[PDB]
Symmetry: C2
């Protein structure tokens, strides 16, 4: 058989795109989106109807142009998620405005607003994951949201300190960014080529996976952002993996069964005391790669958010 | 006349070293030290007596080896400052353990401990500046200390967000790191050579200086960490400048008067509302250079702190 089919025996497959065409082709269980993917998806001609509906709906909610742009941009992200939910049996991840990444209160409010839009469309919370950046503020926001019945996807996770803090907060799921970790090492290190087993991103997710299973944490581990299928195969066994259409295609076209790589067969160990903000900050900042990438990821998503608002603005 | 003498007409000269030999040669008003300089100073043979006194004193304060190492390391930094105060009429800057940079409470306690050691030696607070890293936690610590009569030197300042937060906290003085800003641009940018006037570090300090004088902030602006005398000359007029002995030598050996570069001749403008933690974090992290350098600076100072403790440990 092919790699994609074989991978499904050990890992839940998730598609990383806002394009419904991939949902039909690969039949993933869940789907993930982010500001950059939503921006690209808005370029898709067939998605024109989703944009028009969003704008129309927004103009019917208020007469304030400022609020209309916000309502239209949020509704568009929700409309795309709604189309995807028609093709997948699992969940859709929708990301909150990245500009609120360092504001716990504003992030909680925004998350509840998105949940509201999905609920107004008849979709219940169990089909959604609100995606936020894994800053200390984002984690604190998520801890609160989970208590109120809103499951979260903690993304842009790079350091072990972030992983630990997320598990202790009891979040539904985490998305460590494998490929971006590799990117950093290629650019800031002498070594430019890595064997799959030595890929920094792979090693990072593997250690996180072990730490989580070893202590009985229920937080789902979902590797994300890949550069090649080698990273994916090396993580076979990870709870879930969200993969871009291009890599999904390569897996489906390659023959040969694969073997499970990630497993924890021991018994559960006792959990340590919770890490504090001070310890979190010290440990996170001890990681040059994590320091750079977390801040950078947030900057890029914020820019894409602004570009989308610009686009919507010219339609009002 | 020479450059050094001319510079003194517009700017207060400060020596950046723990070596008393430079104090006698350049007669600076104040002197600054940091963990790296304290470590180097401990290598100076004539400083052997200062180390022995520190160790002896520590063993007389307690019988706990753990506490002795801490007492010995703090006393050594204070002993070096005490030697310098005999040669300078102004202040000495002594830095708190960098490992506490993200812990407000621990930083306040450590600062008070150092103040205690100086007071036990008969030195009053007006001759000292407690130096801390400009993280949000360090700034909050400083705001509290200033209220209790302890003046601070907010260092490792890179972003405008840090500068603004420091002025609003009412700190006694800030130390923006000019040379390290240049280092980042040389390494992460295409352009490797900068004219003094276009030096990123110089432009940064100039904008900070303007912002401070324009709003009537009393916080002293002291440019620090230089790579060449060009940066120094381009900042003539800055409240103070702390310069390494090597650059101090170059200024003294070069002939020719210099002209004042930094000045604010307008009237004071009203101050804006205070920046919040969320806004501070968003703005600071918008600066790729500041993100990298602040975290890196703290990492290096922490390592030097550990090396000093190692050294002291083998003497107990």
């Amino acid at each position: 058989t092919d790699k994609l089919t074989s991978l499904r025996q050990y890992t839940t497959v998730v598609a990383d795109t806002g394009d419904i065409a991939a949902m039909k082709l690969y039949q993933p269980q869940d789907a993930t989106t982010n500001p950059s993917l939503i921006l690209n998806a808005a370029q898709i001609p067939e998605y024109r109807k989703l944009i028009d509906d969003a704008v129309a709906w927004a103009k019917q909610q208020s007469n304030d142009r400022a609020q209309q742009i916000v309502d239209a941009t949020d509704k568009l992200a929700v409309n795309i998620g709604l189309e995807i939910l028609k093709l997948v049996p699992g969940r859709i991840s929708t990301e909150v405005d990245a500009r609120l990444s360092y504001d716990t209160e504003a992030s909680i409010a925004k998350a509840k607003r998105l949940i509201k839009l999905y609920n107004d469309a008849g979709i219940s919370n169990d089909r959604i994951l609100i995606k936020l950046a894994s800053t200390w503020q984002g984690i604190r926001a998520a801890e609160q949201l989970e208590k109120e019945g809103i499951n979260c996807n903690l993304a842009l996770l790079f350091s072990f300190a972030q992983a630990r803090a997320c598990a202790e907060a009891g979040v539904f799921l985490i998305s460590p960014f494998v490929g971006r970790i590799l990117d950093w090492y290629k650019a800031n290190t002498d070594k430019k080529e890595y064997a799959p087993a030595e890929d920094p991103g792979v090693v990072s997710v593997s250690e996180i996976y072990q730490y989580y299973k070893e202590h009985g944490y229920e937080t789902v581990v979902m590797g994300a952002s890949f550069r090649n299928i080698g990273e994916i195969l090396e993580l076979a066994g990870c709870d879930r993996l969200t993969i871009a259409p291009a890599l999904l295609k390569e897996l489906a076209e390659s023959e040969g069964a694969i073997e499970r790589k990630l497993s924890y067969t021991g018994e559960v160990k006792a959990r340590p005391a919770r890490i504090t903000e001070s310890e979190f900050l010290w440990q996170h900042n001890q990681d040059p790669m994590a320091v750079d990438k977390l801040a950078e990821g947030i900057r890029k998503f914020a820019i894409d958010q602004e570009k989308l608002e610009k686009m919507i603005g010219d339609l009002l």
